[PDB]
Amino acid sequence: TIDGQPLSLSLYATPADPSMLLSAAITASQGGGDLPHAVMPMYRFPVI
Amino acid sequence: LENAKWGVSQLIQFGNTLLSITERQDAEALAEILQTQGSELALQSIKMQ
Fold first, then answer.
1. Do residues A15 and B38 make contact, with C-beta atoms less than 8 angstroms apart?
2. How far apart are CA B9 and CA A17, in angstroms?
3. CA distance A9 to chain B (A)
4. Buried b (16+ CB within 10 A) or exposed e, B6-29
5. Residue A18 contacts B where some CB pair is shorter than 8 Å
6. Contact yes or no for A48/A41 (Cβ under 8 A)
7. Backbone dihedral region of A4: left (phi > 0), alpha (psi from -120 to 50 degrees) or beta?
8. Cβ(A1)–Cβ(A7) under 8 Å?
9. Contact at CB, A18 and B46, closer than 8 angstroms
């Protein structure tokens, strides 16, 4: 203008949106229990 | 009768344990779904601010 102020208005850039935070549960896989060696005892079946 | 009462007492124990496990499972899934929708509401509240 006569005073130095601009006629055409300014551009308003869009701000960035807040992102959505993500989490996860990674999982493991260990081996199972393997059977030991069997020993024969001295007692009968109802006692053992 | 002693063998049968043994087996049925063990079954009573297993049914009680199964009940406790399924109600803990339901409470845990409820808390998880609550945390998920709380996260979504927090995002929406930031977008309002």
1. no
2. 61
3. 26
4. eeeeeeeeeeeeeeeeeeeeeeee
5. yes
6. yes
7. left
8. yes
9. yes
What is the rounded distance in angstroms from the CA atom of residue B3 to the CA atom of residue A27? 42
Residues of A whose CB is below 8 A from B45:
none
CB contact under 8 A, A18 and B43: yes
Token digits for B39?
Answer: 């996260």
Question: Hunting for tokens 């079946």 — which residue is that?
Answer: A45
Q: Tell me whether residues A20 and B47 touch, CB distance under 8 A.
A: no
Name the closest residue on chain A to residue B45, using Cα atoms.
A18
* B46 and A CB contact within 8 Å: yes
Tokens 């977008």 found at: B47
Share in percent of chain A as helix, strand, coil (round to 5): 0, 0, 100
